[PDB]
UniProtKB/Swiss-Prot annotation:
The lineage of its organism: Eukaryota, Metazoa, Chordata, Craniata, Vertebrata. Changing C185A: Abolishes poly(ADP-ribose)-binding and poly-ADP-ribosylation by PARP1. A zinc finger (PBZ-type) spans 183-205. The PBZ-type zinc finger (also named CYR) mediates non-covalent poly(ADP-ribose)-binding. Poly(ADP-ribose)-binding is dependent on the presence of zinc and is required for its function in antephase checkpoint. The FHA domain plays a key role in the anti-proliferative properties of the protein and is involved in initiating a cell cycle arrest at G2/M. The FHA domain may be required to interact with phosphorylated proteins. Belongs to the CHFR family. It is found in: Nucleus, PML body. Disulfide bonds: none annotated. This is E3 ubiquitin-protein ligase CHFR. CHFR is silenced in many primary cancers because of CpG methylation and deacetylated histones on its promoter region. This however raises the question of whether CHFR silencing is a consequence or a cause of primary cancers. Interacts with HDAC1 and HDAC2. Interacts with PML (with sumoylated form of PML). Poly-ADP-ribosylated. In addition to binding non covalently poly(ADP-ribose) via its PBZ-type zinc finger, the protein is also covalently poly-ADP-ribosylated by PARP1. Autoubiquitinated; may regulate its cellular level. E3 ubiquitin-protein ligase that functions in the antephase checkpoint by actively delaying passage into mitosis in response to microtubule poisons. Acts in early prophase before chromosome condensation, when the centrosome move apart from each other along the periphery of the nucleus. Probably involved in signaling the presence of mitotic stress caused by microtubule poisons by mediating the 'Lys-48'-linked ubiquitination of target proteins, leading to their degradation by the proteasome. Promotes the ubiquitination and subsequent degradation of AURKA and PLK1. Ubiquitous.
Length: 212
């Protein structure tokens, strides 16, 4: 497939098939990869970077998919900045929405707790990443640190896990009594019924599956 990117030489551009009517420059033997976020081609320089750390990262260290943001700036509605060190990743203004269990009721409780104290999601992440570094909080992607260069989706996935642990560690005395009065759901954080508003309001889902 003929491909022309931001950094392709002019001669390449003028040789593409024409439309229908009613510092780096790409070498001949080089290749292109499509940004997983914006679908636009960029020169694929990952192999080069392996022995030259001077080349900007072009992939998420967690899912290994390519993203163009650190390399030359990605633009798309819905794109907040799709590749970054985790501690600096832009998760968007709505990242607290459904952050706990995809459960708006549980999530609103956390939003209220943070807003009451004038805290932002950023403050919560910073505190959570301190705990992560001490080994007090844990991640499924267990090798991720605040310094890992990762994408929006992988960062968000870990932010949900850190946030759940942050929530877990809030003393009951610091939450409204209407929150703490609710009995634990037998099925815990993975309950499938908590997507229904009534069930979500009735039971606490910040807990684990009941076993014995
Ligand atoms: Zn190119
Ligand atoms: Zn990723
Ligand atoms: Zn992009
Ligand atoms: Zn992007
Ligand atoms: Zn439940």
């Amino acid at each position: 497939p003929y491909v022309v990117c931001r950094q392709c030489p002019e001669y390449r551009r003028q040789a593409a098939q024409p439309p229908h009517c009613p510092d780096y420059v790409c070498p001949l033997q080089g290749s292109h990869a499509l940004c997983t976020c914006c679908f636009q081609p960029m020169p694929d320089r990952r192999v080069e970077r392996e022995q030259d750390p001077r080349v900007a990262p072009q992939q998420c260290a967690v899912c290994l998919q390519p993203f163009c943001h650190l390399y030359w700036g990605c633009t798309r509605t819905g794109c907040y900045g799709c590749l970054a060190p985790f501690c600096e990743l832009n998760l968007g203004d709505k990242c607290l929405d459904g952050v706990l269990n995809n459960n708006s009721y549980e999530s609103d409780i956390l939003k209220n707790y943070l807003a009451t104290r004038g805290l932002t999601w950023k403050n919560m992440l910073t505190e959570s990443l301190v705990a992560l570094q001490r080994g007090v909080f844990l991640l499924s992607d267990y090798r991720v640190t605040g310094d890992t260069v990762l994408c929006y989706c992988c960062g968000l996935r870990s932010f949900r896990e850190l946030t759940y642990q942050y929530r877990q560690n809030i003393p009951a005395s610091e939450l409204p009594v209407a929150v703490t009065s609710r009995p634990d759901c037998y099925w815990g954080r993975n309950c499938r019924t908590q997507v229904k508003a009534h069930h979500a309001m009735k039971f606490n889902h910040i807990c684990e599956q009941t076993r014995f």
